[PDB]
Design a protein around this nucleic acid. Structure first.
Ligand SMILES: [Mg+2]
Ligand SMILES: [Mg+2]
Ligand SMILES: [Mg+2]
Ligand SMILES: [Mg+2]
Ligand SMILES: [Mg+2]
Ligand SMILES: [Mg+2]
Ligand SMILES: [Mg+2]
Ligand SMILES: [Mg+2]
Ligand SMILES: [Mg+2]
Ligand SMILES: [Mg+2]
Ligand SMILES: [Mg+2]
Ligand SMILES: [Mg+2]
Ligand SMILES: [Mg+2]
Ligand SMILES: [Mg+2]
Ligand SMILES: [Mg+2]
Ligand SMILES: [Mg+2]
Ligand SMILES: [Mg+2]
Ligand SMILES: [Mg+2]
Ligand SMILES: [Mg+2]
Ligand SMILES: [Mg+2]
Ligand SMILES: [Mg+2]
Ligand SMILES: [Mg+2]
Ligand SMILES: [Mg+2]
Ligand SMILES: [Mg+2]
Ligand SMILES: [Mg+2]
Ligand SMILES: [Mg+2]
Ligand SMILES: [Mg+2]
Ligand SMILES: [Mg+2]
Ligand SMILES: [Mg+2]
Ligand SMILES: [Mg+2]
Ligand SMILES: [Mg+2]
Ligand SMILES: [Mg+2]
Ligand SMILES: [Mg+2]
Ligand SMILES: [Mg+2]
Ligand SMILES: [Mg+2]
Ligand SMILES: [Mg+2]
Ligand SMILES: [Mg+2]
Ligand SMILES: [Mg+2]
Ligand SMILES: [Mg+2]
Ligand SMILES: [Mg+2]
Ligand SMILES: [Mg+2]
Ligand SMILES: [Mg+2]
Ligand SMILES: [Mg+2]
Ligand SMILES: [Mg+2]
Ligand SMILES: [Mg+2]
Ligand SMILES: [Mg+2]
Ligand SMILES: [Mg+2]
Ligand SMILES: [Mg+2]
Ligand SMILES: [Mg+2]
Ligand SMILES: [Mg+2]
Ligand SMILES: [Mg+2]
Ligand SMILES: [Mg+2]
Ligand SMILES: [Mg+2]
Ligand SMILES: [Mg+2]
Ligand SMILES: [Mg+2]
Lengths: 118, 54, 113, 122, 214
RNA sequence: UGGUUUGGCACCUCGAUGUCGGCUCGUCGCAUCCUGGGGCUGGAGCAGGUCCCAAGGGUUGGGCUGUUCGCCCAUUAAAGCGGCACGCGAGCUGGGUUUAGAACGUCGUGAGACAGUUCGGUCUCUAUCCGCCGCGCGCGUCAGAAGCUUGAGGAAACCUGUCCCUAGUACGAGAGGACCGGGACGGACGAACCUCUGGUAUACCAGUUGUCCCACCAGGGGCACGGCUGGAUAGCCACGUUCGGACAGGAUAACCGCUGAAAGCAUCUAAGCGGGAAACCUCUUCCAAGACCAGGCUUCUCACCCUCUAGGAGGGAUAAGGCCCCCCGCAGACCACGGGAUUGAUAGACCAGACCUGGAAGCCUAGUAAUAGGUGCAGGGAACUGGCACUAACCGGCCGAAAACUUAC
């Protein structure tokens, strides 16, 4: 993907990767998540790429997704349910909805969901 | 450094005036049978009911 | 697609033999000498190659009288008459920069069989 | 690619080994030296029995460079060690034998004796 | 007198001369253009011709511009510029509705290029104006790259309006003169210009007949 | 004449005027170093001596002393003289001078001193105003908007060398050796650009030390300057690629003149007419109608009400247009700028290509072993190019238009 044009988010590339992986696994487990807008903006392409790798199920893809997210239960449920459900759709795997602003810091949030129309 | 003299009242007020805030625009949206005003930035959230309204 | 392809194709030169870095090659190069040309032969080994389509370039190296020498040629240079590959090599990496600190027998490369 | 206070290896039989660059000719405040440029320098180490002893001041010409130099055709040249040739006022060599190959630019720089005496050219 | 033509910058590419030489060139797409208006002395006070370029959907343009183009008698276009001539005989050559192409030029004729520079953003003094910094060690106090002394003391006692110092750079019109032209392609209507010309990929550029020597 | 060195007066400042050089950065004068144009020579010519006009540009790098000053080493045309609180510490450097030790020598019996010598010795401050470099909001240009331009008026740059012809001719006893005019090749400086070479590459690839972890083999991950090593697509830059230094015209300084009385002659002059330079004005690039004489050519709408009291004004509703929000950029401190809003390729993903990297896992085979070979231009991959509405730009809100009159036609 395109690397962040400006300075990283958390204060280190390691923190970037770890936080992004944590958000990805949480999203896969739940389905709906609300957080700061920039985090969702950065996450969307990563989730799309992960689902792309998932779409064509095979041992190599299994190994890659495991290497990336590191959670056996999550990978199992992923390749058990999500994979086939997105068989006929090309691209456009996620949507982001803008939501109301915060009170403590006045920083906007946004909620992202998996497409479920079909 | 430091300032040398106390500026004039007129100068102070003139410089102060520009410091303010701007109001945002509103849009009419209908939910649950009544019309209430929300910013256009929250149209989809209001439609889907993901934003709480007092 | 290299949108400049429709202009590059006209000047693109065909009939270039395939080869890989780390192979013994000799090149025939044209030269002008007092309004009279001749053919000069340069035998050496290739160590790098940058993909550039029309601008692709490669290098050759040879040891001469205890001091090494190298050259760079545009792959589609009209001064090039024939490329004659001699042997096929085998090295793990695609770039052979590390040879510059080796002398004598150490500079030898395994032959691919 | 030679500047002031540099060390160059002599590829001649005059007896000099290393010469200390003083500065380069060709114009006021001339900064960078290229193949085929007249230079004035002084010898630092030389064979004890040589014709010229250490501490003299002489003029030479650069013949080899280690920095890639553009050729008008598009080919490039770099060498593994800088080399220079001792020269005198008449633009001819002081010695009689040249060691190692030499560049091609000398031909159009009009130094004919050096190219003729050189064993190989490029 | 002084011919001209519009175009667009595309990129860079190599071409080899018949004498077996190497010369980088730029590719410029001088697309077809139309003449919408002519300026005459007794009407305006000068002599010039108006051109247009670009393909745009009708609903894009605004109504006054659409009406102007309709009155002229041509379809809408994106950009418009003019070429300033020096006499009446030359302007007499051009007429409204005429179509121009890249053929008008011939190889070996020097021309000029006009365009806009890049966007560099706010930059420091040493970069924008090529100042020379000072010692980075042996007793520095965080003055590594700032200029330093700026003017006199009490005589006169100001900054001498016009002094060179920090500020934004780039994003302005720049021109280069007497550039050689190598080859012209009729079917593709593209130009091969030796050297590098200002602008950015997919930008606007106007080329004119050389003045200095042409 | 100049007030620039050494000097004389104590008139402004002891509830403070911080100090020599160096570094960086200017600006000005000419008593001219070259670059330019002339004349007089104890001017054969090259080359010299002197005077006159001329301030556009440039005026190197090193060794020695803290040094100013000064000496020396190698080229070029030269390595010019000075002012601006002996330019510049709210931009920087503390080498000595001017604090507290100790010593040497001298003076003094002593406490100490000596513009004599040697060693180390804290340099503070968050920008109110003027000014300057950039960018915004408001307001008028006489109905309101939009596209395109004239230029008063300003800014930017202004540098030269080597070689070959003319001709070994003119000149000169010889040695030696030209004016003018053409042709070729170079140094510095500046601008633009990334196609070739180079620098960089914090979500790329491969190897590898230690350790912990995913039940274990295999295979993987976290951490230890990205753990360390060998490699680079894009973007930004130079050591890289191109190009710039005018020609020509007008009026002038120094000088050279033609016709000519005063004053029968003579004289470049008092009437007139001419030649004559990087100096001046146009000619090169850029800014520019807040130039208040507020310019010029065009196209678009040129119409719906209410109120106070009918004198004008205010308020509400509209057209042209603009703005807010939304996706973005090589446009970017923020704003602004440029494109896009379903009548759609703006971004993301997918496919495909180029490119980078270098031969995946599993299986099988050979080898006891550590390892190698086949399935295989293999596997993985951001920045460049093309197709696809799969996702995201929406059933959307705010500003926004003739008091008029006088004169000839
Ligand atoms: Mg610059
Ligand atoms: Mg520096
Ligand atoms: Mg500090
Ligand atoms: Mg520092
Ligand atoms: Mg007094
Ligand atoms: Mg007083
Ligand atoms: Mg006082
Ligand atoms: Mg004080
Ligand atoms: Mg002071
Ligand atoms: Mg001081
Ligand atoms: Mg004078
Ligand atoms: Mg002179
Ligand atoms: Mg004289
Ligand atoms: Mg002068
Ligand atoms: Mg000037
Ligand atoms: Mg010293
Ligand atoms: Mg001064
Ligand atoms: Mg001072
Ligand atoms: Mg001074
Ligand atoms: Mg000064
Ligand atoms: Mg300060
Ligand atoms: Mg201050
Ligand atoms: Mg002391
Ligand atoms: Mg002191
Ligand atoms: Mg004491
Ligand atoms: Mg004491
Ligand atoms: Mg004593
Ligand atoms: Mg005594
Ligand atoms: Mg005593
Ligand atoms: Mg002593
Ligand atoms: Mg001490
Ligand atoms: Mg102090
Ligand atoms: Mg302080
Ligand atoms: Mg202040
Ligand atoms: Mg301020
Ligand atoms: Mg003007
Ligand atoms: Mg590099
Ligand atoms: Mg780099
Ligand atoms: Mg483990
Ligand atoms: Mg297992
Ligand atoms: Mg670890
Ligand atoms: Mg670290
Ligand atoms: Mg990392
Ligand atoms: Mg590394
Ligand atoms: Mg490579
Ligand atoms: Mg760069
Ligand atoms: Mg007379
Ligand atoms: Mg007379
Ligand atoms: Mg106006
Ligand atoms: Mg509007
Ligand atoms: Mg905008
Ligand atoms: Mg493997
Ligand atoms: Mg990519
Ligand atoms: Mg892109
Ligand atoms: Mg309103």
């Amino acid at each position: 993907p395109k690397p962040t044009k400006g300075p990283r988010l958390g204060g280190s590339s390691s923190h970037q990767s770890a936080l992004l992986a944590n958000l990805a696994t949480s999203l896969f487990e739940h389905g709906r998540i609300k957080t700061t807008e920039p985090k969702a903006r950065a996450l969307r392409p990563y989730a799309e790429k992960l689902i792309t790798h998932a779409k064509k199920g095979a041992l190599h893809n299994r190994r890659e997704v495991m290497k990336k997210i590191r959670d056996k239960d999550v990978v199992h449920t992923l390749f058990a349910e999500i994979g086939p459900f997105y068989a006929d759709r090309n691209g456009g795997y996620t949507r982001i909805i803008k939501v109301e602003n915060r009170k403590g810091d006045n920083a906007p949030m946004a909620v992202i969901e998996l497409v479920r129309e079909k | 450094a430091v300032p040398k003299r106390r500026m004039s009242r007129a100068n102070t007020r003139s410089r102060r005036a520009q410091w303010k805030a701007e109001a945002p625009g509103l849009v009419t949206v209908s939910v649950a049978g009544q019309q209430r005003k929300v910013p256009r930035r929250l149209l989809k959230a209001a439609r889907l009911g993901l934003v709480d309204l007092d | 697609m290299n949108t400049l392809d429709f202009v590059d194709q006209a000047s693109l030169r065909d009939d270039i033999p395939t080869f890989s870095p780390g192979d013994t090659v000799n090149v025939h190069v044209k030269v002008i000498e007092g309004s009279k040309e001749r053919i000069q032969v340069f035998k050496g080994v290739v160590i790098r190659r940058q993909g550039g389509g029309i601008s692709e370039t490669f290098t050759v190296r040879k040891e001469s009288y205890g001091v090494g020498v190298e050259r760079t040629f545009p792959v589609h240079s009209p001064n090039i008459d024939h490329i004659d590959v001699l042997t096929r090599g085998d090295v793990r990496r695609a770039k052979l920069y590390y040879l510059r600190e080796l002398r004598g027998k150490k500079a030898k490369i395994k032959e691919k069989r | 690619m030679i500047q002031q206070e540099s060390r160059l290896k002599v590829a001649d039989n005059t007896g000099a080994k290393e010469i200390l660059c003083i500065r380069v000719l060709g114009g006021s405040s001339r900064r960078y030296a290229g193949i085929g440029d007249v230079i004035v320098a002084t010898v630092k180490d030389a064979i004890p029995g040589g014709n010229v002893k250490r501490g003299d001041v002489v003029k030479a010409v650069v013949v080899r460079t280690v920095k890639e130099r553009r050729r008008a055709d598009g080919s490039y040249i770099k060498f593994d060690e800088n080399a220079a040739v001792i020269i005198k006022n008449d633009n001819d060599p002081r010695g009689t034998r040249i060691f190692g190959p030499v560049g091609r630019e000398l031909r159009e720089k009009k130094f004919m004796k050096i190219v003729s005496l050189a064993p190989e050219v490029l | 007198a002084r011919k001209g033509i519009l175009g667009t910058k595309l990129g860079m590419t190599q071409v080899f001369d018949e004498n077996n030489k190497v010369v980088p060139v730029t590719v410029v797409k001088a697309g077809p253009n139309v003449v919408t208006r002519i300026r005459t002395t007794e009407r305006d006070g000068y002599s010039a011709v108006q051109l247009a370029y670009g393909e745009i959907s009708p609903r894009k343009v605004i109504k006054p511009v659409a009406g102007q183009f309709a009155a002229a008698g041509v379809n809408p276009r994106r950009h418009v510029a003019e070429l300033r001539l020096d006499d009446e005989a030359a302007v007499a050559e051009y007429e409204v509705g005429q179509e121009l192409t890249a053929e008008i030029f011939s190889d070996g004729a020097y021309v000029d290029v006009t365009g806009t520079s890049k966007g560099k953003g706010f930059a420091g003094t040493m970069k924008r104006h090529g100042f020379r910094g000072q010692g980075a060690a042996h007793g520095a106090q965080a003055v590594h790259r700032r200029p330093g002394s700026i003017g006199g003391c009490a005589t006169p006692g100001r900054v001498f309006k016009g002094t060179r110092m920090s500020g934004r750079m780039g994003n302005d019109r720049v021109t280069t003169q007497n550039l050689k032209v190598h080859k012209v392609d009729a079917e593709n209507g593209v130009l091969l210009i030796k050297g590098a010309i200002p602008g950015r990929n997919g930008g606007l550029v106007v080329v004119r007949s050389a003045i200095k020597r042409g």
